Write a protein that binds this ligand. Structure first.
Ligand SMILES: O=c1[nH]c2cc(C(F)(F)F)c(N3CCOCC3)cc2n(CP(=O)(O)O)c1=O
Ligand SMILES: O=c1[nH]c2cc(C(F)(F)F)c(N3CCOCC3)cc2n(CP(=O)(O)O)c1=O
Lengths: 245, 164, 111, 139, 111
C-alpha cells in the first residue's frame, strides 16, 4: 500500500512505471485516473498561455463604497475646500463613513495642494487614492506620465455656470448663448480640444500601446520553498533510517 | 577552501554592477557593491537597505541567510580537522561534515536569489536617483556561483569515501 | 482665474498683447459668447486668485465674486461652482459643465 | 532573424542559470538513499523517459518526484510564453492606410515643414485627415 | 437594415434581451439607471454618458414662483435631498440591490 503509492505519483503526470499489474482492473482503472490527470495539466498550460498574452490590468475599485468598505488603500481630499466640507456635511452614511475615516485618518491624508495630491498617489504606489473634481481629473489623466486615472461615476451633480452680477441684463442673452452652444456641441468640441487634443496622452492611443514580453524570475522563486522544504525532508527520513541501522 | 574563498568574495563585493547614467545631464559612472555603493567623481558611500517597507523585510531575512551560509562552511573544516586528528568512529563526523556544507549553499543560493530578487525589484523601482542602464551582474557574484559547485564537488568525493 | 485647461497664459504671452495673451477652454468660450452676443470683451485676472468667499466677520466677498458683487467686473466667464450662497448675490447662467467629485487613483501596472 | 539567442527567448537568462543550478541540487539527494549513476536519472527525470532505477518508495522517490513535479510546470510555461510571442508577432499588422497611422501613436509620421501637403491636412475637413492634423499640430 | 429603431422603450428593453446581447440600445441615463434595477436585471448601463443634459423644474415665463423654486432646488441638491430620493426611487424601490452589481464575478482563472 506504500510501494505502489509512489507509482500513483509515478502515474501522476509522467515517468512510466516499472511495476505494472499487467492487464487486470488495476491496470485499466489505474489508467483512468491517469487519463483524468492529464486533462488538468493540459487546461493549465492553455489558461497560463492566455494570462501571459492578453495582459489586462484589472482596476481594484470602482466606487466610493469600495474605499469605505476597505482600509488598505488610503484616500484623501484637499486640506481645505468644499470637498472636505462636503463629507463634513453629507449625511448619507457612506459619505459619513468616509468622513469618519478621514477625521480618524492618521497621518493626515489631507494634502496642501492639488499637485501634491497628484504626486502622493504616484509616490505611495496606488495605496493612496485622492478625491478631486471630475473635469480636472479628466485633464490630469491626459497629462504625462498619465499614470493616474479616474474610476467610477461621480459622487454628485455639480455645475459650473457663467456668472453675471445680479440684475444685469447681460445674463439672459448669455443664458440664450450657453444653451445654444451646448445644444450644438460647441462646448464638446472644445472639451475634446482642451482635454484630449491638448492632452499629453491619448487614453486609447496609450491603450493601443501595451505589448509585453518574457517571464520574470519572480514566479519561480516562491516555488523554491517547496523544493527546499522537500530537501529538509531528505535528511529526516534518512536519519531515522540510521536509527533503523 | 575554494568554495569558502569565493563565498566571502561575495561578502567583499566592491562592484555588484556597473552603474551608467550617461544621459545627454551628463556622463555618470557608478560602481555599487553588494552593500557599499561606490561611484565614479571618485567617492564611495554605503546605500544599504533601501525602500519600500517590505523589501526591507526581505532584507532582514536576507542578511540572516547570508550569515547562515558562512557559518555552515566553517562546520566542514572543523570535522575534517578532526579527521586529521584521527589521521595522525571517523566516518560519522565526515558524513555529517558534508551535510552542513550542502545545507550551506542551499540556504546560500536562496540568499543569492533573494538579493537578486532585491536587485530586480529595486531596478523596477528605478532606485531613487541611481537607475543604471547596466545591470551587468557581479563579477565576484558570478564567482560566488562557482562557490556552490565547489561545495558540490567537495561533497561528491567525501561521500565517495563514505561508501567504503 | 488662470486655470488649466480653462484659462492659461500663452507661452509667448510677453510677446502677445491684449486678450490674446490668454488661452484655454474658457478663453475660446469667451470668444463664443462674443460670437453669440456680439460684444468686445476684456479678459482680466482676479488679483487674490480666489473663486470668491464671503467673510465671516466683515461679510465681504473676495475673489471673482467680489469683483461681480462690488461692480468691479462685468461678467465672469470662469469655472465657478453654482452654490446657494453665491446664487443670492449674483445671477448665474445655466450650468455648461456637469461635474462632481471623482476618484483619482493610480492606474495599475503592479505584479 | 537571429539564431542561438532565439532558442533562449521565452525563458530569461537568469532562469536558464537557475533551472540548472536547482537541477544540480537533485544530485546527491538521489545519492542520499545510500552519485554519477543517478545523475542521468535526474536527467531521466528532467522531462520524460521514465527511469529504470527507482528507489521504490522512500524519500528519494517522493522528493525525486517533487523536482519532477516542478520542472513540468516550466516547459509548459516555455510553451505558453513562446506562443505568447508568436501570437503578438503575427498580430503586428503593417500600416496600409492613413487610418492606421491615425488610430495608433507608436510610429510617428510627418510631412514637410511647409507646403500644400501640410496645408492639405490643415484644410481637409474629413475627420481622419483632421485627426492626423490634430496629431501633427500636437506633435 | 433591418431598422434598429424600435417603437417603444419597453420594446427596446426586451429586444436587447431577445437578441442575446447582439442588439444594444441607447436611452437616457437615469431611465437606464431604473430599468437596470428592475428584475430580471439582465440589462446594464456601460460607459460614461454621451452628453450633459439636465431636467429642470419649469414655471411659465415671467412667473415670480420660479425664483424661490430656484432657491429651493439649489438648497435641496446641496443637502443631498435629491440623492436620498435618488437612492429611494432607483435602489430602494429597485427590484435588485445596489451591491448586486458587486456580484458580477470578475476575471477569475479556470472555471
Ligand atoms: O466654487 C469653487 N470653484 C472651484 C473651481 C476650481 C476650478 F475648476 F479649477 F476652476 C477649483 N480647483 C480645482 C482644480 O485645481 C484648482 C482649484 C476649485 C474650486 N473651489 C474650491 P473647493 O471649496 O475645494 O471646492 C470652489 O469652492
Ligand atoms: O505645384 C507644385 N508642384 C510641386 C512639384 C514637386 C515635384 F514632385 F518635385 F515635382 C514638389 N516637390 C515634392 C518632392 O520634393 C521636391 C519638391 C513640390 C511641388 N509644389 C510644392 P507644395 O506646396 O508642397 O505642393 C507645388 O506647389
Amino acid at each position: 500500500i506504500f510501494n505502489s503509492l509512489w507509482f500513483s505519483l509515478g502515474a501522476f503526470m509522467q515517468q512510466g512505471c516499472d511495476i505494472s499489474p499487467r492487464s487486470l482492473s488495476g491496470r485499466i482503472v489505474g489508467g483512468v485516473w491517469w487519463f483524468f490527470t492529464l486533462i488538468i495539466i493540459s487546461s493549465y498550460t492553455a489558461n497560463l498561455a492566455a494570462f501571459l498574452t492578453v495582459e489586462r490590468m484589472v482596476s481594484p475599485i470602482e466606487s466610493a463604497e469600495d474605499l469605505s468598505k476597505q482600509t488598505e488603500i488610503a484616500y484623501g481630499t484637499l486640506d481645505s475646500g468644499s470637498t472636505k466640507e462636503f463629507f463634513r456635511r453629507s449625511k448619507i452614511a457612506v459619505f459619513d463613513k468616509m468622513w469618519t475615516y478621514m477625521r480618524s485618518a492618521e497621518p493626515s491624508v489631507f494634502v496642501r495642494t492639488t499637485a501634491e495630491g497628484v504626486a502622493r498617489v504616484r509616490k505611495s504606489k496606488g495605496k493612496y487614492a485622492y478625491l478631486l473634481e471630475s473635469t480636472m481629473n479628466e485633464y490630469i489623466e491626459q497629462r504625462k506620465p498619465c499614470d493616474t486615472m479616474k474610476v467610477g461615476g461621480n459622487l454628485d451633480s455639480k455645475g459650473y455656470g457663467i456668472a453675471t452680477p445680479k440684475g444685469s441684463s447681460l445674463g439672459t442673452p448669455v443664458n440664450l448663448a450657453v444653451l445654444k452652444l451646448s445644444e450644438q456641441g460647441v462646448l464638446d468640441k472644445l472639451k475634446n480640444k482642451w482635454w484630449y487634443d491638448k492632452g499629453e496622452c491619448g487614453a486609447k492611443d496609450s491603450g493601443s500601446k501595451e505589448k509585453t514580453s518574457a517571464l520574470s524570475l519572480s514566479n519561480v522563486a516562491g516555488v523554491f520553498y517547496i523544493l527546499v522544504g522537500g530537501l529538509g525532508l531528505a535528511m529526516l527520513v534518512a536519519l531515522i533510517e540510521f536509527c533503523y541501522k | 577552501l575554494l568554495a569558502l574563498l569565493f563565498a566571502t568574495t561575495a561578502f567583499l563585493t566592491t562592484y555588484w554592477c556597473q552603474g551608467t547614467q550617461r544621459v545627454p545631464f551628463q556622463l555618470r559612472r557608478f560602481h555599487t557593491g553588494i552593500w557599499y555603493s561606490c561611484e565614479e567623481g571618485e567617492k564611495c558611500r554605503s546605500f544599504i537597505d533601501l525602500a519600500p517597507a517590505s523589501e526591507k523585510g526581505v532584507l532582514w531575512l536576507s542578511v540572516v541567510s547570508e550569515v547562515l551560509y558562512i557559518l555552515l562552511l566553517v562546520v566542514g573544516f572543523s570535522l575534517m580537522c578532526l579527521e586529521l586528528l584521527h589521521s595522525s568512529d571517523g566516518l560519522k563526523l565526515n558524513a555529517f561534515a558534508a551535510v552542513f556544507t550542502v545545507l550551506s549553499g542551499l540556504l546560500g543560493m536562496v540568499a543569492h536569489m533573494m538579493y537578486t530578487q532585491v536587485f530586480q525589484v529595486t531596478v523596477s523601482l528605478g532606485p531613487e536617483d541611481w537607475r543604471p542602464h547596466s545591470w551587468d551582474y557581479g563579477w565576484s557574484f558570478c564567482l560566488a556561483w562557482g562557490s556552490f559547485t565547489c561545495c558540490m564537488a567537495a561533497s561528491v568525493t567525501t561521500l565517495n569515501s563514505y561508501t567504503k | 482665474i488662470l486655470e488649466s485647461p480653462y484659462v492659461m497664459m500663452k507661452k509667448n504671452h510677453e510677446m502677445l498683447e491684449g486678450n490674446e495673451r490668454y488661452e484655454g477652454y474658457c478663453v475660446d468660450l469667451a470668444a463664443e459668447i462674443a460670437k453669440h452676443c456680439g460684444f468686445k470683451y476684456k479678459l482680466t485676472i482676479v488679483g487674490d486668485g480666489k473663486y470668491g468667499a464671503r467673510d465671516a466677520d466683515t461679510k465681504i466677498w473676495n475673489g471673482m465674486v467680489g469683483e461681480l458683487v462690488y461692480g468691479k467686473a462685468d461678467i465672469a466667464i470662469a469655472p465657478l461652482t453654482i452654490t446657494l450662497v453665491r446664487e443670492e448675490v449674483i445671477d448665474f447662467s445655466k450650468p455648461f459643465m456637469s461635474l462632481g467629485i471623482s476618484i483619482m487613483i493610480k492606474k495599475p501596472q503592479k505584479s | 532573424k537571429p539564431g542561438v539567442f532565439s532558442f533562449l527567448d521565452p525563458l530569461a537568462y537568469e532562469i536558464w542559470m537557475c533551472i540548472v543550478f536547482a537541477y544540480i541540487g537533485v544530485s546527491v539527494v538521489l545519492f542520499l538513499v545510500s552519485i554519477f549513476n543517478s545523475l542521468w536519472f535526474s536527467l531521466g527525470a528532467f522531462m520524460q523517459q521514465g527511469c529504470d532505477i527507482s528507489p521504490r518508495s522512500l524519500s528519494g522517490r517522493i522528493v525525486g518526484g517533487v523536482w519532477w513535479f516542478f520542472t513540468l510546470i516550466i516547459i509548459s510555461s516555455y510553451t505558453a510564453n513562446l506562443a505568447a510571442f508568436l501570437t503578438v508577432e503575427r498580430m503586428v499588422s503593417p500600416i496600409e492606410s492613413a487610418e492606421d497611422l491615425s488610430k495608433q501613436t507608436e510610429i510617428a509620421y510627418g510631412t514637410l515643414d511647409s507646403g500644400s501637403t501640410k496645408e492639405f491636412f490643415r484644410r481637409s475637413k474629413i475627420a481622419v485627415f483632421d485627426k492626423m492634423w490634430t496629431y501633427m499640430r500636437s506633435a
